[PDB]
Design a binder for this molecule. Structure first.
Ligand SMILES: [Ca+2]
Ligand SMILES: [Ca+2]
Ligand SMILES: [Ca+2]
Ligand SMILES: [Ca+2]
Ligand SMILES: [Ca+2]
Ligand SMILES: [Ca+2]
Ligand SMILES: [Ca+2]
Ligand SMILES: [Ca+2]
Ligand SMILES: [Ca+2]
Ligand SMILES: [Ca+2]
Ligand SMILES: [Ca+2]
Ligand SMILES: [Ca+2]
Lengths: 326, 326
């Protein structure tokens, strides 16, 4: 028989094979053994169930693993296989309307999407806190931070310069293709998910927001836009291609465990979210760059990430570019 | 301003950056300097124009570069840049209805698609031979050959076994996910384009068709199906995941130059076309495998590649699986 679960198997494979992600959660949960042991937990967007089993293994008394997608069935199978059907309970459907027998002492979730908030489960986590979390109850992870830096994307640089190098390899000039490749690769308003390294970072990264997940007003702030201003000074001479946005999340310490998606840190499946200018701009050591970044819901889909960028490079005029995920 | 030529720039970048491809054509054209010098050429599906300039550079008197996609405009720019607007002429639109001032002494084309015949220009090349090629005229490349071998795809092997290794890394058993991953990754009828190496080849590759491009009856054979039977004996003990199909093309010698897409040869953007069985089958040294492979047009689209596989492994019954490109 035939199945169309290829894409489905692929994404869960990707998340679990992300050892930075998955080991951070394993360790972050065990860090909170003292506050979990004998306690009840809700896992929002439980997927294949691995995080809920981790909670069990930190000594949680009972875990409710809620998952709306079709993978919920594999999660029940996995729970059973680990001898935990008595303690970890798999409930299909969205957390917004699932009905539990009791309020919980903790919520755990890997809710983060690309650019933190693309197709993320944050709204669901916050709905569940309000509805099902006891007072004094805990959230794992407990906070997030957002960062921006200017970039000189060395791979993009190579793709654009490609056409001018054709002469040197095949003896035909194609340098005229360069303006075209620039229009095609940068002349759009889509957020590009791509992994960079420090070789691409052109100024000290800046934190432009800090979100305490349990704080009053966050659901409203998500609606109106999460972001802030930033200022930085370039390291050296390079083509500025735009900006990169990434995040970290923090687990309580029970020294906090930080899971980072920075290009200066080990790679993760989240990579980074790249915001390209329409064409490269030359910068130099100490060229100043300021601006503002705002993460927003899209008009027809709150879970499709929009990013509004305002930026000023040196003594160029401030400009605006409004981006969205495909 | 914004543009949607990203995908467009990407594919041409890919072809030209394919040095095996592009250098094979450069050399194959120059091999035929004697038959080109002072002669007229038609380049079918000229793209960015690079192959037509190669023909000029082999001393062709005049080259007609015909291209139906939007890239034809960049080709005219590239020709001009190489000082060849007097000799190489860029004509938009499909070759089937383009009107040239004269018949030609040669047709050149990189017409091959994935699996040779997915979204290929072969039908167009054959139409142009009939309509515009002089008698005694030449085609570059002049022939193609198709090959099949059984494979043990080491990357697929790793993906399937992934779930049983989760215990060893995170201390949660997910071996039950394996049946699921198998359904999802192999339980479909899509041709998968993927690059392999000899570490994946499980028996001596077999040639199942040879196409002399200028031969009578080929347009008809393409309609009815190109293919043939094959027999082979496995090297050793491994999970059989299915079969790989690839091709080569040959340029006249003026020792023929062969451009190959075999996994035993240097990588090309064509990679190989993989035909997965619904699940892995154990084989051993000298396990015999026979069958038949046929490349066919799809019912609603002759340029969407269909492959009908009949195969028999050892003393298992012959089976059939009917594949197509997405
Ligand atoms: Ca996630
Ligand atoms: Ca999506
Ligand atoms: Ca990458
Ligand atoms: Ca700040
Ligand atoms: Ca703010
Ligand atoms: Ca300054
Ligand atoms: Ca091609
Ligand atoms: Ca297609
Ligand atoms: Ca590959
Ligand atoms: Ca044969
Ligand atoms: Ca045949
Ligand atoms: Ca035998």
């Amino acid at each position: 028989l035939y199945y169309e679960c290829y894409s489905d198997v692929s994404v869960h494979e990707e998340m679990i094979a992300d050892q930075v992600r998955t080991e951070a959660y394993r360790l972050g949960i065990l860090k909170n053994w003292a506050a979990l042991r004998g306690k009840t937990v809700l896992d929002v967007g439980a997927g294949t169930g691995i995080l809920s089993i981790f909670c069990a293994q930190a000594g949680a008394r009972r875990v409710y693993a809620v998952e709306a997608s079709a993978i919920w069935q594999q999660a029940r199978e996995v729970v059973r296989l680990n001898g935990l059907e008595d303690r970890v309970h798999v409930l299909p459907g969205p957390v917004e309307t699932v009905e539990l027998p009791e309020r919980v002492d903790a919520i755990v979730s890997e809710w983060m999407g690309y650019g933190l908030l693309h197709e993320s489960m944050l709204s669901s986590v916050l709905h569940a806190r309000t509805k099902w979390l006891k007072e004094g109850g805990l959230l794992l992870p407990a906070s997030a931070e957002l960062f921006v830096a200017p970039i000189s994307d060395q791979m993009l640089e190579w793709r654009l310069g490609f056409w001018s190098q054709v002469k040197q390899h095949y003896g035909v000039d194609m340098s005229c293709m360069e303006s075209f490749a620039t229009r095609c690769l940068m002349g759009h308003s889509e957020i590009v998910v791509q992994d960079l390294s420090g070789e691409d970072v052109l100024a000290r990264p800046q934190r432009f927001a800090q979100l305490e997940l349990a704080r009053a007003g966050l659901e409203q702030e998500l609606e109106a836009g999460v972001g802030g201003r930033f200022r930085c000074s370039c390291y050296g001479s390079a083509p500025l291609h735009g900006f990169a946005v990434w995040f970290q999340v923090t687990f309580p310490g029970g020294k906090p465990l930080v899971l980072s998606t920075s290009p200066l840190h080990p790679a993760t499946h989240w990579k980074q979210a790249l915001l390209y200018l329409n064409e490269p701009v030359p910068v130099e050591q100490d060229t100043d760059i300021s601006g503002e970044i705002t993460l927003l819901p899209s008009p027809d889909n709150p879970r499709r990430l929009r990013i509004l960028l305002r930026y000023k490079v040196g003594d160029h005029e401030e400009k605006t570019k409004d981006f969205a995920m495909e």
